[PDB]
């Protein structure tokens, strides 16, 4: 497998804060055309080869600062991470869909040279938390060729999406009063495909913000979703299949093996 970056993983390996990459950070402005702009960030050694990426989408009201911190230390594990910012902070789950693939275009066709020549434009992921999260749905309605889809406590009107052909990983919390798992995050999971490889995984005791701090337990799992399917890279199988039994997490679901 030649998409294959970074040593053999280990159980500390994908809990680490920082991966085996150093990270380096190109800005974009507020003026791109189809998203509000945002921060990517990159793998600095190139020696391995290019990379996948992964658009971030923030929540209602919320700004790019509330995905901030899955940069580093997602890029850090080999992979171009796009922290975006929606045009406005009202935008429904389907303008964020449409704007986490503007995100995708604009790193593909207009980014700086430093991004674009470490970029592999095949693979590509998108990732949001709440009204992101549901445009992360929505955006692999739109756009099937994507590899990956990371809704964390996801919320959407919309709640079915047995159209779903990417493999998607669906973070709940199981106290989270604004987008509740038993209405959004649960319904959303029982409704992709059986067929479709996918997993949901819900947090013990975490609330709605949960996603915007540092979190190990979805950290790690993050990374592992984004290596088997963006990367196709089968070592880190033994982290999703079978069902992840952390003490932090409430209860686990999935489709394993992929
Ligand atoms: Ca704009
Ligand atoms: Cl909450």
Redesign the pocket.
């Known amino acids: 497998n030649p998409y294959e970056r970074g040593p053999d993983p280990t159980e500390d390996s994908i809990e680490a804060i920082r991966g085996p990459f150093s990270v380096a950070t190109e800005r974009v402005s507020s003026f791109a055309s189809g998203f509000g702009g945002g921060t990517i960030y990159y793998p600095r050694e190139t020696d391995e080869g290019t990379f996948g990426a992964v658009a971030v989408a923030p929540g209602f009201t919320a700004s790019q600062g509330s995905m901030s911190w899955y940069g580093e230390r997602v890029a850090s594990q080999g992979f171009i991470v796009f922290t975006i910012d929606t045009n406005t902070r009202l935008d429904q789950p389907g303008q964020r869909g449409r704007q986490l693939l503007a995100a995708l275009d604009y790193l593909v066709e207009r980014s700086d040279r430093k991004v674009r020549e470490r970029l592999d434009p095949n693979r590509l992921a998108v990732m949001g938390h709440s009204m992101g999260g549901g445009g992360s749905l929505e955006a692999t309605v739109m756009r099937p060729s994507l590899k990956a889809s990371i809704p964390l406590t996801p919320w959407n009107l919309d709640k079915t999406w047995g159209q779903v052909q990417v493999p998607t990983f669906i973070i709940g919390?199981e106290?989270?009063?604004?987008?509740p798992v038993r209405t959004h995050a649960k319904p959303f999971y029982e409704s992709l495909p059986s067929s479709l490889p996918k997993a949901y995984m819900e947090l013990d005791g975490a609330?709605?913000?949960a996603p915007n701090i540092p979190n190990t337990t979805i950290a790690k799992y993050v990374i592992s979703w984004l290596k088997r399917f963006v990367d196709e890279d089968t070592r880190y199988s033994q982290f999703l299949c079978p069902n992840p039994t952390d003490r932090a997490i409430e209860e686990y679901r999935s489709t394993c093996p992929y």
């Open positions: 919390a106290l989270d009063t604004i987008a609330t709605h913000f």
